[PDB]
Amino acid sequence: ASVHGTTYELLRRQGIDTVFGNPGSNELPFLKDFPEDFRYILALQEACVVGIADGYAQASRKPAFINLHSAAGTGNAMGALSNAWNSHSPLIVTAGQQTRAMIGVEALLTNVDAANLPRPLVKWSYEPASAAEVPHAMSRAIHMASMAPQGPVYLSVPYDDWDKDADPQSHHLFDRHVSSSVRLNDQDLDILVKALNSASNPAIVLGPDVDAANANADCVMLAERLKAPVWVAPSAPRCPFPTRHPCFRGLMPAGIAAISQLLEGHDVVLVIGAPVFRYYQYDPGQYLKPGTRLISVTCDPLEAARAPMGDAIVADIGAMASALANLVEESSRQLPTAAPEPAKVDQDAGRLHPETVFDTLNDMAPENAIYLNESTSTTAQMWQRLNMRNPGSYYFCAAGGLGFALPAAIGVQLAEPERQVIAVIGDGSANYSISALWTAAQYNIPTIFVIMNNGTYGILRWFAGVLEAENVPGLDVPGIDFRALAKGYGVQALKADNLEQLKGSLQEALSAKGPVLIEVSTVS
Template identity: 60%
Template sequence: MTTVKQASYELLRANGITTIFGNPGSNELPFLGAMPEDFRYILGLHEGVVMGMADGFAQATGKAAFVNLHAASGTGNAMGALTNAWYSHTPLVISAGQQVRPSIGMESMLSNVDATTLPRPLVKASSEPACAEDVPRSLSHAIHIATQDPKGPVYISVPYDDWDADAGEVSVNLAGRSVQAAGTPSRQQLEPFIGALASAANPVLVLGPDVDAARANHQAVALADKLKMPVWVAPSAPRCPFPTTHPSFRGVLPASISGISALFKEHDVVLVVGAPVFRYHQFEPGEFLPAETTLLHITGDPGEAARAPMGAALVADVSEALQALTEGVPESDRPLPAARIVAPPPRAGGTVLAPEAVFELINEVAPRDAVYVNEATSTVGALWDRLDMTHPGSYYFPASGGLGFGMPAAVGVQLANPNRRVIGIIGDGSANYGITALWTAAQEKIPVVFVILNNGTYGALQAFATKLKAENVPGLSVPGIDFCALANGYGVQAAKVTELNDLKQKLTTALEAEEPTLIEIMTTTISPF
């Protein structure tokens, strides 16, 4: 007899999913007991951290990651982090232990009441198999749904008495299945896009996270070079789809209606690829698009295409579409855009450093293929201006703006990229949401470098308070936290630096270490606007 548990592990193995991120409870023990030796279990001390690590791991590998949560309470703990995975199109297979079937209706302790509804609307699909024999097929369904464009998290609740049941005949052929999608646009579909770009006097390219996720960065460069277009990254960027050192790179669009529209006034055609149109944040109303400007949109997500307030959209494979556009458009005789000029960093006095100066030093010391996981939200603009990100998969940021992503994601990204060095740039306010990720990094000897920018406040909120004319807002200061002491308590080497030469030495040492390191830096507060 093949048990449901045996069939499920074989299914995960066949799909290359052998790393499990979790924090177990009693409902999960029957699945985890006697776990096959070729599987690896990464323990997080809170489900939000578990989800963040899996999110970073899946984004960095481009493959589905498996998450094991504890019933309803564990799912609830992970929901904040799940918002980031949803908006990042992260392929996650999320399992949650359920009470034994005879006890669910009585709402016994640890029953996941109405389990399929709980994680919605932050999952592509949610299920609880109708019987034990359907668990492997439901798991197979979840894997293939999670990995089909648009990728995203999928949830499955499994009663813990199912694992030892007979898997039955339905499981026999599951491990050998594959599901593929053909999303290459036809020449007829692309012709209006090619014609508009070819005749444009001053086109501009806007790139989103799905370009980096598809590893189509080089294709975006080829298109920009052929048409001599300036290139912006879509607002609130969770990934870096274009080399920041390229002369056409202009930065990240502001996340406001009027701010974006103002930047498009000189452009007659705007091509948006691999991003929503647009993820606005601060409400600054105005015209969505200048009157004489045409917007074209290519996305792998039908939902993004349908809900956009303007433009002609094409739902297609982002990589294939970029390649076809590059081949179809004529070479432009326009001059290349002039490289932008970044202002020198301000000087900060005493033992407090300017974030701009910190980023310039990090850029000097870090390897060229370094990966940055950013959750210092008030310094995002300064970071994009000063870090050279030239390789695909070089940048990750919480896609929904939900804090707690940075430290766990840095662990997951480093786990997925053993041959690249990961630097987590984390604000002091953000760090407290995922601080227990330090323990996992120490236990697993994952050599992440955590750089804590400590300004003693929620800097981004202070800037928003000014913008919103909200005076005397309480709860914006977070003084008195010793991150080095916290790191030492979790088993991570740590140092506090107060001047740039010391930072250079500490960062150089940390990048050569084989275990995690935390560097705490007192910084000035700057506005993200």
């Protein structure tokens, strides 16, 4: 058997049947004789390729396979990999390398010191020392990406390797099962449950790894058992809790003082599946107010190590959430009261307020809709106004790297064809991966794109105000016609200059058969 055949059988047996790519000469030998049982998803830009695979991996909760072209292709994908690292996305990234005979002279398309290129944004980077080693390296890549903490991995393969003969003993690779679904030992776990039962005013904080492990339901039960208010960790890449649940308290502000102030009065704080903490703005103060004890459960050793306070437990979030939810006593305390419904903002017949857009989406979108957010100046309003009952309903670039939501929305839609994906993207962020639109049109992926157009870098303007910075250039982005951009890539475009038009467009988009883009004129 050839390395080519052996490799595809490996992918197939490990449950991988989709290839997200942008091709090059180095990758032709691998793409040739493409298995009929495999699917290839072309994106025009590498940043788009990874974004789409990222959305697909996250929604499907399974590793995604990518094929890029040498250093140039890998390089273009770097920004996307930065997000994938933060969101623990299981991405197997392969890139074609020059033929071994030509690597020495550094011929054109040679990926120099290839393993080093994507570092430090991957848990594993590797180039095999021989063709026969390739299947085994691929097997390594598959399990490294899938083991906790999940993350992107990198593999470089010289194009001449694929036709070579593969080692017959590679058959042992096909059916390897690697598990990391583990939880705290019985003894220590009982001590933890003791502590939770004995707390007089517990609070719970959930991060994206809860949604990734589909432990949302288990967390809901745990909260109901402890009668505890629930928060989502700051800078949230996902949503791990029904946002209308009486326990839900909303998105924590990404500041040190702000968070210790919020947790004040809570004697024990259970953090599940989140870093402690993913702060953003400079907000000096106490990490925790005296009287508050923090206990962290995380799947990532790097997160437990760098937390500046509290105890940490490194385990699988799914197994841990399940264990706790089923072991804690039912507290007699009153169940928390659901937060009040957001106030209706005053809306004239002009440009729409971000609050109005969200309220309208909430009224018109299906109950099982999936939202992506890359509208940076309106994130807070988005969490308050969208009712998200189900898991996997929200995605936001995990490292703050723009260009994520647009291609990811296509990947997510591909992963969940029964759920309407609605991406809310700012006029600024939209340009980073605009060409992903073409993939949506080409593969009939009925994703809905809502472009929030206020002609500027909203968030940046705000920051410039709180720093008091004057004469800052490059904050404005006038002169972009997004309907023409969407026509450029074969996507139906609509405009919403006002509320009347916004409802009309939303109704039309929801009904349309293919992907639709709506340009909304929002206030500055």
